[PDB]
Amino acid sequence: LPPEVLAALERVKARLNKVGEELEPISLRKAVRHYIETPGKLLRPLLLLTFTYSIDRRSIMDPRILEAAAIVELLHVVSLLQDDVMDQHDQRRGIKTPRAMYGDGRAIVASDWLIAESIKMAVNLGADVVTYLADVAQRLSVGQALDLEGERDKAAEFKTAPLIEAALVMPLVILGRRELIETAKKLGTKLGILYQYTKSIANEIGRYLLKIKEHVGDAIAPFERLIKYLIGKA
Amino acid sequence: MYSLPPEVLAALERVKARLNKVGEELEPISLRKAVRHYIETPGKLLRPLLLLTFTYSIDRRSIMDPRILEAAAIVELLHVVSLLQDDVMDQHDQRRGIKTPRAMYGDGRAIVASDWLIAESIKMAVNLGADVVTYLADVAQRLSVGQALDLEGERDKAAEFKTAPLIEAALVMPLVILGRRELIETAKKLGTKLGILYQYSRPETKSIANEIGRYLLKIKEHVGDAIAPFERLIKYLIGKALE
Numbered sequence: 345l346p347p348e349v350l351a352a353l354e355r356v357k358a359r360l361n362k363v364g365e366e367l368e369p370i371s372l373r374k375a376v377r378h379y380i381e382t383p384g385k386l387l388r389p390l391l392l393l394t395f396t397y398s399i400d401r402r403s404i405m406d407p408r409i410l411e412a413a414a415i416v417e418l419l420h421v422v423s424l425l426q427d428d429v430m431d432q433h434d435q436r437r438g439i440k441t442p443r444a445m446y447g448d449g450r451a452i453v454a455s456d457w458l459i460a461e462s463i464k465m466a467v468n469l470g471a472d473v474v475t476y477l478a479d480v481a482q483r484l485s486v487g488q489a490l491d492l493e494g495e496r497d498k499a500a501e502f503k504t505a506p507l508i509e510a511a512l513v514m515p516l517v518i519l520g521r522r523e524l525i526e527t528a529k530k531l532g533t534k535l536g537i538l539y540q541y542t543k544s545i546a547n548e549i550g551r552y553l554l555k556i557k558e559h560v561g562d563a564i565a566p567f568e569r570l571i572k573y574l575i576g577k578a
Numbered sequence: 579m580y581s582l583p584p585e586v587l588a589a590l591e592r593v594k595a596r597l598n599k600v601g602e603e604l605e606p607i608s609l610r611k612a613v614r615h616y617i618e619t620p621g622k623l624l625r626p627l628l629l630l631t632f633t634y635s636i637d638r639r640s641i642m643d644p645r646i647l648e649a650a651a652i653v654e655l656l657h658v659v660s661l662l663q664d665d666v667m668d669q670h671d672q673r674r675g676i677k678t679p680r681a682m683y684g685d686g687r688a689i690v691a692s693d694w695l696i697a698e699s700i701k702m703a704v705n706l707g708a709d710v711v712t713y714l715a716d717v718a719q720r721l722s723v724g725q726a727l728d729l730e731g732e733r734d735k736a737a738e739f740k741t742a743p744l745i746e747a748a749l750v751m752p753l754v755i756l757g758r759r760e761l762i763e764t765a766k767k768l769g770t771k772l773g774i775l776y777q778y779s780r781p782e783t784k785s786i787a788n789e790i791g792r793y794l795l796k797i798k799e800h801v802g803d804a805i806a807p808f809e810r811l812i813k814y815l816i817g818k819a820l821e
């Protein structure tokens with residue numbers, strides 16, 4: 345990716361590394377930080393920073409944009425911790441989970457602590473951002489309930505897609521480019537459904553990328569590559 | 579029982595009505611049932627009662643303010659979130675002769691329901707301003723730390739973080755909303771002690787009731803006899819704790 349995005353991503357990583365740094369008791373801090381400290385892909389923050397750079401290169405190092413990327417990664421951590429408890433997971437890709445190592449109680453309380461932290465950070469981004477994240481959370485909750493209730497098809501859109509779309513929507517709300525929201529939402533949702541795993545899914549994504557390109561033009565390159573590259577995997 | 583103003587009881591009915599709207603048409607059904615369980619089998623509505631009674635004593639006209647009614651409902655929702663999660667952590671299959679949501683649907687739904695409620699409360703708090711939102715998130719983190727200390731076998735340090743933070747928010751929210759910051763410090767002390775005392779439902783217990791009396795006295799010096807219904811309520815809660 346572009347050097348500027350990589351640099352942004354480093355600030356985000358440094359910001360995430362401070363979360364819970366002095367949290368007490370220690371059992372809570374470890375449960376909170378496990379998924380911050382274990383090596384991850386940082387898909388969501390990356391999608392957000394690259395989408396920003398593509399739409400407004402100037403705003404890449406904007407403090408609100410960096411904080412938003414951190415927020416979306418913290419909400420992803422909350423989802424991991426909760427899924428571990430829902431599904432009683434002992435491992436997540438070869439690595440023992442917080443619930444396995446520290447109990448379900450600590451895992452739950454750490455997700456609560458992180459939701460509050462996410463909210464504290466979101467407040468600075470304004471009321472529209474806070475309300476939107478809360479709507480996102482209610483969609484994820486509904487999806488989990490739908491899955492527990494035996495409706496994998498109805499739960500597909502609400503299962504993990506909301507965070508991916510939030511990665512694309514937050515920068516739009518923050519920067520004021522509301523005209524791209526409806527498409528960014530649509531794309532994020534398709535990207536999300538694809539992620540859980542099918543030919544025309546990477547086709548629509550192609551179209552929505554098209555519409556977006558008709559708005560920002562070629563400045564969309566970096567983001568198109570990432571999507572396309574992410575597209576190739578599937 | 580309750581010797582409180584009919585205006586406070588009336589406000590409480592409107593809070594009950596607002597709470598009855600929460601998650602009304604929510605799907606799926608198991609989510610709706612888990613979410614509304616502790617709202618339909620209602621408790622003593624102590625947290626909303628404290629907020630409303632305190633508001634009435636500081637500013638009587640504000641008991642009809644939509645923001646105050648919303649704040650009362652939010653404090654009850656967070657209490658409901660705490661019940662749902664506590665059911666799961668302590669494995670309660672019944673909570674006062676009634677099957678708990680975790681027992682009926684499994685731990686997953688209780689947790690998810692709590693998640694939906696946290697989100698719903700944030701949505702409601704946004705309408706009350708950034709300070710309310712920030713404050714509630716700080717309350718949430720304290721509750722978290724409190725519960726962690728518990729699980730950690732640290733009842734000592736857990737005393738003030740486990741439930742007190744919500745009792746405190748019942749008194750501090752209305753002050754923030756009405757911009758009466760001068761009383762916040764005392765409201766926090768008072769609320770924290772009331773919460774510590776109310777945790778159980780002896781030597782120290784009276785030392786605590788004495789401290790509360792002094793915080794009440796400080797509020798009285800500030801608002802005069804208008805504080806009387808709140809004072810009766812605190813003395814009543816103190817009473818049962820000492821019974």
Ligand SMILES: C/C=C(\C)CC/C=C(\C)CC/C=C(\C)CCC=C(C)C
Binds near residue numbers: 457459656711717740
């Ligand atoms: C027994 C008590 C426990 C387990 C703590 C429950 C945690 C609660 C009730 C707080 C949930 C609220 C948040 C995580 C964020 C709330 C912030 C706003 C509504 C602005």
